[PDB]
Ligand SMILES: N#Cc1c(-c2ccc3ccn(C[C@@H]4CCCN(Cc5ccccc5)C4)c3c2)n[nH]c1N
Protein backbone atom coordinates (compact mmCIF):
# COMPACT_ATOMS: atom_id res chain seq x y z
CA UNK A 1 0.00 0.00 0.00
CA UNK A 2 2.75 2.46 0.92
CA UNK A 3 6.54 2.47 0.69
CA UNK A 4 9.64 4.36 1.75
CA UNK A 5 12.69 4.11 -0.50
CA UNK A 6 16.17 5.32 0.40
CA UNK A 7 18.86 5.44 -2.28
CA UNK A 8 22.55 5.78 -1.35
CA UNK A 9 24.95 6.87 -4.08
CA UNK A 10 27.96 9.07 -4.77
CA UNK A 11 25.97 10.62 -7.64
CA UNK A 12 22.63 11.70 -6.14
CA UNK A 13 21.91 13.96 -9.14
CA UNK A 14 21.56 10.81 -11.29
CA UNK A 15 18.39 9.90 -9.38
CA UNK A 16 16.70 13.10 -10.66
CA UNK A 17 14.44 11.14 -13.06
CA UNK A 18 12.66 9.54 -10.05
CA UNK A 19 11.76 12.98 -8.71
CA UNK A 20 10.44 13.85 -12.18
CA UNK A 21 8.30 10.69 -12.20
CA UNK A 22 6.55 11.04 -8.82
CA UNK A 23 3.01 12.52 -8.85
CA UNK A 24 2.32 15.05 -6.10
CA UNK A 25 -0.86 13.27 -5.03
CA UNK A 26 0.97 10.03 -4.15
CA UNK A 27 3.45 11.89 -1.97
CA UNK A 28 0.73 14.01 -0.35
CA UNK A 29 -1.39 10.94 0.40
CA UNK A 30 1.71 9.53 2.10
CA UNK A 31 1.74 6.55 -0.28
CA UNK A 32 5.41 6.97 -1.16
CA UNK A 33 8.59 8.73 -0.17
CA UNK A 34 11.92 8.51 -2.00
CA UNK A 35 15.01 9.97 -0.37
CA UNK A 36 18.40 10.13 -2.05
CA UNK A 37 21.57 10.29 0.05
CA UNK A 38 25.11 11.28 -0.90
CA UNK A 39 27.40 8.49 0.37
CA UNK A 40 30.15 11.05 0.97
CA UNK A 41 28.16 12.28 4.00
CA UNK A 42 29.56 9.19 5.77
CA UNK A 43 33.22 9.51 4.76
CA UNK A 44 35.83 9.88 7.53
CA UNK A 45 38.59 11.97 5.97
CA UNK A 46 39.15 15.42 4.52
CA UNK A 47 39.44 13.98 1.01
CA UNK A 48 36.01 12.26 1.39
CA UNK A 49 37.39 8.89 0.22
CA UNK A 50 34.87 6.21 -0.78
CA UNK A 51 37.26 3.79 -2.51
CA UNK A 52 40.55 1.91 -2.01
CA UNK A 53 42.79 -0.66 -3.76
CA UNK A 54 41.53 -4.25 -3.99
CA UNK A 55 43.11 -6.98 -1.89
CA UNK A 56 44.70 -9.58 -4.14
CA UNK A 57 45.11 -7.08 -6.94
CA UNK A 58 42.85 -6.33 -9.85
CA UNK A 59 41.57 -3.57 -12.09
CA UNK A 60 39.91 -0.59 -10.47
CA UNK A 61 39.05 0.26 -6.90
CA UNK A 62 36.68 -1.23 -4.33
CA UNK A 63 34.30 0.87 -2.23
CA UNK A 64 35.24 1.08 1.47
CA UNK A 65 33.35 -1.05 4.00
CA UNK A 66 33.74 1.46 6.83
CA UNK A 67 31.94 4.19 4.85
CA UNK A 68 29.14 1.96 3.55
CA UNK A 69 28.76 0.34 6.95
CA UNK A 70 28.20 3.70 8.64
CA UNK A 71 25.71 4.81 5.99
CA UNK A 72 23.60 1.65 6.13
CA UNK A 73 23.78 1.57 9.96
CA UNK A 74 22.09 4.96 9.97
CA UNK A 75 19.54 4.31 7.21
CA UNK A 76 18.53 0.65 7.65
CA UNK A 77 16.58 -1.17 10.34
CA UNK A 78 15.95 -4.90 10.88
CA UNK A 79 12.76 -4.40 8.82
CA UNK A 80 14.60 -3.03 5.76
CA UNK A 81 14.89 -4.81 2.43
CA UNK A 82 18.42 -3.96 1.32
CA UNK A 83 18.78 -4.03 -2.47
CA UNK A 84 22.28 -4.13 -3.99
CA UNK A 85 22.51 -3.79 -7.77
CA UNK A 86 25.39 -5.81 -9.18
CA UNK A 87 26.08 -7.52 -12.49
CA UNK A 88 26.83 -10.63 -10.40
CA UNK A 89 23.36 -10.58 -8.87
CA UNK A 90 20.32 -12.83 -9.06
CA UNK A 91 18.10 -11.80 -12.01
CA UNK A 92 15.66 -8.97 -11.24
CA UNK A 93 12.36 -10.00 -12.89
CA UNK A 94 8.68 -9.09 -12.80
CA UNK A 95 8.23 -11.73 -10.11
CA UNK A 96 10.81 -9.86 -8.03
CA UNK A 97 9.05 -6.55 -8.67
CA UNK A 98 5.72 -8.04 -7.55
CA UNK A 99 7.28 -9.46 -4.39
CA UNK A 100 8.97 -6.17 -3.43
CA UNK A 101 5.91 -4.00 -4.17
CA UNK A 102 4.40 -4.97 -0.79
CA UNK A 103 7.50 -4.02 1.23
CA UNK A 104 7.52 -1.03 3.59
CA UNK A 105 11.17 0.02 3.34
CA UNK A 106 13.61 -0.50 0.48
CA UNK A 107 17.16 0.74 0.66
CA UNK A 108 19.13 0.63 -2.55
CA UNK A 109 22.91 0.68 -2.25
CA UNK A 110 24.38 1.98 -5.53
CA UNK A 111 27.95 0.96 -6.18
CA UNK A 112 30.57 2.43 -8.47
CA UNK A 113 34.16 1.48 -9.39
CA UNK A 114 34.53 -2.30 -8.99
CA UNK A 115 31.71 -2.49 -6.47
CA UNK A 116 31.36 -2.65 -2.70
CA UNK A 117 33.52 -4.67 -0.28
CA UNK A 118 31.59 -7.94 0.11
CA UNK A 119 31.62 -7.77 3.90
CA UNK A 120 29.10 -4.90 3.79
CA UNK A 121 26.32 -7.08 2.35
CA UNK A 122 27.42 -10.15 4.35
CA UNK A 123 27.29 -8.18 7.64
CA UNK A 124 23.95 -6.60 6.72
CA UNK A 125 22.50 -10.02 5.94
CA UNK A 126 22.97 -11.10 9.57
CA UNK A 127 20.19 -8.74 10.65
CA UNK A 128 18.12 -7.81 7.59
CA UNK A 129 16.97 -9.24 4.25
CA UNK A 130 19.58 -8.51 1.57
CA UNK A 131 19.16 -9.01 -2.18
CA UNK A 132 21.98 -8.75 -4.70
CA UNK A 133 20.29 -8.37 -8.11
CA UNK A 134 21.06 -7.57 -11.77
CA UNK A 135 18.66 -5.87 -14.21
CA UNK A 136 20.13 -7.48 -17.30
CA UNK A 137 23.04 -9.02 -19.14
CA UNK A 138 25.01 -5.89 -20.06
CA UNK A 139 27.57 -3.78 -18.18
CA UNK A 140 26.71 -0.38 -16.69
CA UNK A 141 28.98 2.22 -14.97
CA UNK A 142 27.41 1.72 -11.56
CA UNK A 143 24.21 0.89 -9.73
CA UNK A 144 22.32 4.14 -10.32
CA UNK A 145 20.69 3.25 -13.67
CA UNK A 146 19.70 -0.10 -12.19
CA UNK A 147 18.12 1.76 -9.27
CA UNK A 148 15.99 3.80 -11.71
CA UNK A 149 14.74 0.63 -13.38
CA UNK A 150 14.08 -1.18 -10.09
CA UNK A 151 12.24 1.77 -8.56
CA UNK A 152 10.01 2.19 -11.62
CA UNK A 153 9.22 -1.54 -11.98
CA UNK A 154 8.34 -1.82 -8.29
CA UNK A 155 6.45 1.45 -7.70
CA UNK A 156 4.24 1.10 -10.78
CA UNK A 157 2.80 -1.99 -9.05
CA UNK A 158 1.85 0.07 -5.97
CA UNK A 159 -1.70 1.36 -6.58
CA UNK A 160 -1.79 5.12 -7.22
CA UNK A 161 1.92 5.78 -6.92
CA UNK A 162 3.17 6.54 -10.45
CA UNK A 163 -0.16 7.50 -12.01
CA UNK A 164 -0.43 4.41 -14.22
CA UNK A 165 -3.46 2.14 -14.19
CA UNK A 166 -3.21 -1.61 -13.70
CA UNK A 167 -5.23 -3.32 -16.42
CA UNK A 168 -7.05 -6.65 -16.18
CA UNK A 169 -4.86 -8.16 -18.92
CA UNK A 170 4.57 -16.84 -20.92
CA UNK A 171 4.33 -15.16 -24.32
CA UNK A 172 5.37 -11.78 -25.76
CA UNK A 173 2.66 -9.23 -26.53
CA UNK A 174 1.87 -8.82 -30.23
CA UNK A 175 1.51 -5.57 -32.22
CA UNK A 176 -0.94 -2.76 -31.38
CA UNK A 177 -2.70 -0.34 -33.74
CA UNK A 178 -4.66 2.89 -33.52
CA UNK A 179 -5.93 5.68 -35.84
CA UNK A 180 -5.67 6.34 -38.71
CA UNK A 181 -6.91 3.12 -40.32
CA UNK A 182 -4.47 3.66 -43.22
CA UNK A 183 -1.02 5.29 -42.95
CA UNK A 184 1.86 5.44 -45.46
CA UNK A 185 0.26 2.61 -47.42
CA UNK A 186 -0.10 0.40 -44.37
CA UNK A 187 -3.61 -0.63 -43.31
CA UNK A 188 -4.55 -1.73 -39.81
CA UNK A 189 -5.14 -5.53 -39.99
CA UNK A 190 -8.81 -5.88 -41.07
CA UNK A 191 -9.59 -8.51 -38.43
CA UNK A 192 -9.23 -5.81 -35.76
CA UNK A 193 -12.16 -3.93 -37.33
CA UNK A 194 -14.31 -7.04 -37.84
CA UNK A 195 -16.31 -6.96 -34.61
CA UNK A 196 -15.60 -10.69 -34.25
CA UNK A 197 -13.95 -10.62 -30.84
CA UNK A 198 -13.29 -14.37 -30.60
CA UNK A 199 -11.46 -14.20 -33.94
CA UNK A 200 -9.56 -11.09 -32.82
CA UNK A 201 -8.36 -12.86 -29.68
CA UNK A 202 -7.21 -15.85 -31.75
CA UNK A 203 -5.37 -13.56 -34.19
CA UNK A 204 -3.60 -11.81 -31.31
CA UNK A 205 -2.65 -15.14 -29.71
CA UNK A 206 -1.10 -16.32 -33.00
CA UNK A 207 0.80 -13.00 -33.39
CA UNK A 208 2.13 -13.48 -29.87
CA UNK A 209 3.19 -17.05 -30.63
CA UNK A 210 5.07 -16.04 -33.79
CA UNK A 211 6.74 -13.08 -32.13
CA UNK A 212 7.86 -15.22 -29.19
CA UNK A 213 9.31 -17.92 -31.47
CA UNK A 214 11.21 -15.26 -33.43
CA UNK A 215 12.46 -13.05 -30.61
CA UNK A 216 12.41 -15.11 -27.39
CA UNK A 217 12.53 -18.83 -28.15
CA UNK A 218 13.95 -19.33 -24.62
CA UNK A 219 10.42 -18.75 -23.32
CA UNK A 220 9.11 -21.90 -25.03
CA UNK B 221 32.23 8.99 -32.79
CA UNK B 222 28.48 8.71 -32.18
CA UNK B 223 25.35 10.84 -32.16
CA UNK B 224 22.38 9.66 -30.10
CA UNK B 225 18.96 11.27 -30.51
CA UNK B 226 16.20 10.32 -28.06
CA UNK B 227 12.55 11.04 -28.89
CA UNK B 228 10.07 11.12 -26.00
CA UNK B 229 6.89 12.78 -24.72
CA UNK B 230 8.60 12.84 -21.32
CA UNK B 231 11.81 14.80 -22.02
CA UNK B 232 11.94 15.99 -18.39
CA UNK B 233 12.86 12.44 -17.35
CA UNK B 234 16.09 12.31 -19.41
CA UNK B 235 18.56 14.91 -18.12
CA UNK B 236 21.07 13.22 -16.09
CA UNK B 237 22.24 13.07 -19.72
CA UNK B 238 33.45 15.13 -27.56
CA UNK B 239 33.53 11.82 -29.36
CA UNK B 240 29.83 11.56 -28.52
CA UNK B 241 26.73 13.74 -28.22
CA UNK B 242 23.22 13.01 -26.94
CA UNK B 243 20.15 15.10 -27.80
CA UNK B 244 16.65 14.76 -26.31
CA UNK B 245 13.62 15.69 -28.43
CA UNK B 246 10.05 16.36 -27.27
CA UNK B 247 7.77 14.37 -29.58
CA UNK B 248 4.92 16.82 -29.00
CA UNK B 249 6.85 19.41 -31.04
CA UNK B 250 5.73 17.51 -34.16
CA UNK B 251 2.05 17.52 -33.28
CA UNK B 252 -0.44 18.08 -36.11
CA UNK B 253 -2.85 19.84 -33.77
CA UNK B 254 -2.03 21.36 -30.38
CA UNK B 255 -5.53 20.49 -29.17
CA UNK B 256 -5.02 16.79 -29.96
CA UNK B 257 -3.19 14.09 -27.96
CA UNK B 258 -0.52 11.80 -29.38
CA UNK B 259 -2.48 8.75 -28.17
CA UNK B 260 -5.77 7.14 -29.19
CA UNK B 261 -7.82 4.00 -28.44
CA UNK B 262 -6.60 0.62 -29.78
CA UNK B 263 -8.22 -0.97 -32.79
CA UNK B 264 -9.71 -4.31 -31.80
CA UNK B 265 -9.82 -3.23 -28.17
CA UNK B 266 -7.30 -3.63 -25.40
CA UNK B 267 -6.09 -2.00 -22.23
CA UNK B 268 -4.83 1.51 -22.55
CA UNK B 269 -4.05 3.91 -25.30
CA UNK B 270 -1.67 3.53 -28.22
CA UNK B 271 0.56 6.25 -29.69
CA UNK B 272 -0.48 7.30 -33.19
CA UNK B 273 1.98 6.69 -36.03
CA UNK B 274 1.41 10.10 -37.61
CA UNK B 275 3.31 12.23 -35.08
CA UNK B 276 6.11 9.65 -34.84
CA UNK B 277 6.49 9.51 -38.60
CA UNK B 278 6.95 13.27 -38.84
CA UNK B 279 9.47 13.35 -35.98
CA UNK B 280 11.53 10.42 -37.26
CA UNK B 281 11.57 11.69 -40.86
CA UNK B 282 13.28 14.86 -39.65
CA UNK B 283 15.73 13.20 -37.25
CA UNK B 284 16.72 10.00 -39.13
CA UNK B 285 18.62 9.19 -42.30
CA UNK B 286 18.88 5.88 -44.13
CA UNK B 287 22.13 5.23 -42.22
CA UNK B 288 20.44 5.67 -38.83
CA UNK B 289 19.93 2.76 -36.47
CA UNK B 290 16.41 3.14 -35.05
CA UNK B 291 16.17 1.57 -31.59
CA UNK B 292 12.72 0.93 -30.11
CA UNK B 293 12.55 -0.16 -26.47
CA UNK B 294 9.70 -2.61 -25.86
CA UNK B 295 9.09 -5.46 -23.39
CA UNK B 296 8.31 -7.58 -26.46
CA UNK B 297 11.69 -6.85 -28.10
CA UNK B 298 14.77 -8.98 -28.83
CA UNK B 299 16.97 -9.14 -25.71
CA UNK B 300 19.41 -6.22 -25.34
CA UNK B 301 22.68 -7.75 -24.12
CA UNK B 302 26.39 -6.94 -23.93
CA UNK B 303 26.82 -8.44 -27.42
CA UNK B 304 24.19 -5.93 -28.63
CA UNK B 305 26.05 -3.11 -26.91
CA UNK B 306 29.32 -4.13 -28.69
CA UNK B 307 27.53 -4.27 -32.05
CA UNK B 308 26.03 -0.80 -31.61
CA UNK B 309 29.20 0.79 -30.20
CA UNK B 310 30.61 1.38 -33.68
CA UNK B 311 27.46 3.00 -35.08
CA UNK B 312 27.55 6.63 -36.23
CA UNK B 313 23.94 7.47 -35.35
CA UNK B 314 21.38 5.98 -32.95
CA UNK B 315 17.81 7.23 -32.63
CA UNK B 316 15.88 5.93 -29.65
CA UNK B 317 12.09 6.11 -29.95
CA UNK B 318 10.61 6.00 -26.43
CA UNK B 319 6.98 4.99 -26.09
CA UNK B 320 4.51 5.50 -23.27
CA UNK B 321 0.89 4.35 -22.66
CA UNK B 322 0.59 0.86 -24.17
CA UNK B 323 3.22 1.60 -26.77
CA UNK B 324 3.63 2.84 -30.31
CA UNK B 325 1.49 1.82 -33.31
CA UNK B 326 3.32 -1.10 -34.97
CA UNK B 327 3.35 0.60 -38.39
CA UNK B 328 5.97 3.09 -37.14
CA UNK B 329 8.61 0.35 -36.84
CA UNK B 330 7.31 -1.55 -39.86
CA UNK B 331 7.35 1.52 -42.13
CA UNK B 332 10.75 2.65 -40.86
CA UNK B 333 12.16 -0.80 -41.64
CA UNK B 334 11.50 -0.18 -45.35
CA UNK B 335 14.05 2.67 -45.32
CA UNK B 336 16.48 2.10 -42.44
CA UNK B 337 17.62 -0.53 -39.95
CA UNK B 338 15.24 -0.97 -37.02
CA UNK B 339 15.77 -2.80 -33.72
CA UNK B 340 13.01 -3.56 -31.22
CA UNK B 341 14.74 -4.54 -27.95
CA UNK B 342 14.03 -5.23 -24.29
CA UNK B 343 16.42 -4.47 -21.45
CA UNK B 344 14.96 -7.19 -19.19
CA UNK B 345 12.00 -9.32 -18.12
CA UNK B 346 10.16 -6.76 -16.01
CA UNK B 347 7.57 -4.10 -16.95
CA UNK B 348 8.23 -0.35 -17.01
CA UNK B 349 5.77 2.53 -17.63
CA UNK B 350 7.60 3.61 -20.80
CA UNK B 351 10.83 3.53 -22.81
CA UNK B 352 12.76 6.35 -21.12
CA UNK B 353 14.43 4.25 -18.36
CA UNK B 354 15.35 1.69 -21.01
CA UNK B 355 16.84 4.46 -23.15
CA UNK B 356 19.06 5.54 -20.22
CA UNK B 357 20.26 1.95 -19.73
CA UNK B 358 20.96 1.46 -23.46
CA UNK B 359 22.86 4.75 -23.69
CA UNK B 360 25.02 3.89 -20.66
CA UNK B 361 25.88 0.38 -21.84
CA UNK B 362 26.73 1.51 -25.38
CA UNK B 363 28.60 4.75 -24.72
CA UNK B 364 31.09 3.12 -22.36
CA UNK B 365 32.17 0.90 -25.30
CA UNK B 366 32.56 3.64 -27.91
CA UNK B 367 36.21 3.79 -29.11
CA UNK B 368 38.08 6.38 -27.07
CA UNK B 369 35.47 6.85 -24.33
CA UNK B 370 30.05 -16.30 -19.34
CA UNK B 371 30.64 -16.08 -15.57
CA UNK B 372 29.68 -13.84 -12.66
CA UNK B 373 32.29 -11.73 -10.86
CA UNK B 374 33.33 -13.02 -7.46
CA UNK B 375 33.53 -10.89 -4.29
CA UNK B 376 36.02 -8.01 -3.82
CA UNK B 377 37.64 -6.64 -0.65
CA UNK B 378 39.70 -3.68 0.49
CA UNK B 379 41.09 -2.25 3.75
CA UNK B 380 40.92 -2.88 6.68
CA UNK B 381 41.82 -6.58 6.63
CA UNK B 382 39.51 -7.27 9.59
CA UNK B 383 36.22 -5.36 9.92
CA UNK B 384 33.46 -6.01 12.49
CA UNK B 385 35.23 -9.30 13.15
CA UNK B 386 35.03 -10.29 9.47
CA UNK B 387 38.36 -11.12 7.85
CA UNK B 388 39.34 -10.66 4.21
CA UNK B 389 39.96 -14.19 2.80
CA UNK B 390 43.62 -14.94 3.70
CA UNK B 391 44.59 -16.08 0.19
CA UNK B 392 44.01 -12.50 -1.04
CA UNK B 393 46.73 -11.32 1.35
CA UNK B 394 49.17 -14.04 0.25
CA UNK B 395 50.69 -12.33 -2.81
CA UNK B 396 50.43 -15.70 -4.60
CA UNK B 397 48.93 -14.80 -8.00
CA UNK B 398 48.22 -18.43 -8.91
CA UNK B 399 46.41 -19.28 -5.66
CA UNK B 400 44.46 -16.00 -5.83
CA UNK B 401 43.42 -16.64 -9.43
CA UNK B 402 42.32 -20.15 -8.41
CA UNK B 403 40.28 -19.01 -5.42
CA UNK B 404 38.63 -16.28 -7.49
CA UNK B 405 37.79 -18.79 -10.22
CA UNK B 406 36.17 -21.07 -7.64
CA UNK B 407 34.19 -18.16 -6.21
CA UNK B 408 32.94 -17.14 -9.65
CA UNK B 409 31.92 -20.74 -10.41
CA UNK B 410 30.00 -21.11 -7.20
CA UNK B 411 28.28 -17.77 -7.70
CA UNK B 412 27.31 -18.48 -11.31
CA UNK B 413 25.87 -21.93 -10.55
CA UNK B 414 23.80 -20.56 -7.69
CA UNK B 415 22.62 -17.30 -9.28
CA UNK B 416 22.74 -17.74 -13.05
CA UNK B 417 22.82 -21.45 -13.88
CA UNK B 418 21.48 -20.56 -17.35
CA UNK B 419 24.87 -19.04 -18.21
CA UNK B 420 26.49 -22.47 -17.83
CA UNK B 421 23.76 -24.30 -19.75
CA UNK B 422 21.57 -25.46 -16.89
CA UNK B 423 17.87 -25.02 -16.16
CA UNK B 424 16.73 -21.78 -14.55
CA UNK B 425 15.15 -22.42 -11.09
N1 LIG C 1 22.31 -4.33 -11.53
C1 LIG C 1 23.19 -4.16 -12.30
C2 LIG C 1 24.21 -4.01 -13.35
C3 LIG C 1 25.44 -3.32 -13.39
C4 LIG C 1 26.24 -2.65 -12.29
C5 LIG C 1 25.73 -2.63 -10.88
C6 LIG C 1 26.55 -2.08 -9.89
C7 LIG C 1 27.84 -1.58 -10.21
C8 LIG C 1 28.86 -1.01 -9.46
C9 LIG C 1 29.95 -0.70 -10.37
N2 LIG C 1 29.61 -1.11 -11.58
C10 LIG C 1 30.43 -0.94 -12.76
C11 LIG C 1 31.51 -2.01 -13.02
C12 LIG C 1 32.26 -1.65 -14.20
C13 LIG C 1 33.23 -2.63 -14.50
C14 LIG C 1 32.68 -4.05 -14.51
N3 LIG C 1 31.87 -4.36 -13.38
C15 LIG C 1 32.59 -4.48 -12.32
C16 LIG C 1 31.79 -5.08 -11.13
C17 LIG C 1 31.62 -6.41 -11.04
C18 LIG C 1 30.87 -6.99 -9.92
C19 LIG C 1 30.32 -6.17 -8.96
C20 LIG C 1 30.49 -4.79 -9.04
C21 LIG C 1 31.23 -4.24 -10.11
C22 LIG C 1 30.87 -3.36 -13.20
C23 LIG C 1 28.34 -1.64 -11.55
C24 LIG C 1 27.50 -2.20 -12.59
N4 LIG C 1 25.96 -3.50 -14.54
N5 LIG C 1 25.06 -4.27 -15.37
C25 LIG C 1 24.02 -4.56 -14.66
N6 LIG C 1 22.88 -5.31 -15.09
Ligand SMILES: N#Cc1c(-c2ccc3ccn(C[C@H]4CCCN(Cc5ccccc5)C4)c3c2)n[nH]c1N
Pocket residue numbers: 165166167168169267292293294295297318319320321322323324341342343344345346347348349350351354
Ligand atom coordinates in the same frame (compact mmCIF):
# COMPACT_ATOMS: atom_id res chain seq x y z
N1 LIG D 1 12.78 -1.92 -23.21
C1 LIG D 1 11.92 -2.10 -22.42
C2 LIG D 1 10.90 -2.39 -21.40
C3 LIG D 1 9.68 -1.76 -21.09
C4 LIG D 1 8.91 -0.72 -21.86
C5 LIG D 1 9.45 -0.11 -23.10
C6 LIG D 1 8.65 0.77 -23.84
C7 LIG D 1 7.33 1.05 -23.42
C8 LIG D 1 6.30 1.86 -23.92
C9 LIG D 1 5.15 1.72 -23.01
N2 LIG D 1 5.50 0.86 -22.05
C10 LIG D 1 4.66 0.45 -20.95
C11 LIG D 1 3.72 -0.72 -21.37
C12 LIG D 1 4.44 -1.72 -22.09
C13 LIG D 1 3.68 -2.85 -22.48
C14 LIG D 1 2.40 -3.05 -21.69
N3 LIG D 1 2.45 -2.59 -20.34
C15 LIG D 1 1.25 -2.41 -19.97
C16 LIG D 1 0.58 -3.51 -19.13
C17 LIG D 1 -0.34 -3.08 -18.13
C18 LIG D 1 -1.00 -4.03 -17.31
C19 LIG D 1 -0.75 -5.38 -17.48
C20 LIG D 1 0.14 -5.81 -18.45
C21 LIG D 1 0.82 -4.83 -19.30
C22 LIG D 1 3.05 -1.31 -20.16
C23 LIG D 1 6.79 0.44 -22.25
C24 LIG D 1 7.61 -0.48 -21.47
N4 LIG D 1 9.15 -2.39 -20.12
N5 LIG D 1 10.06 -3.42 -19.65
C25 LIG D 1 11.09 -3.41 -20.41
N6 LIG D 1 12.23 -4.28 -20.29
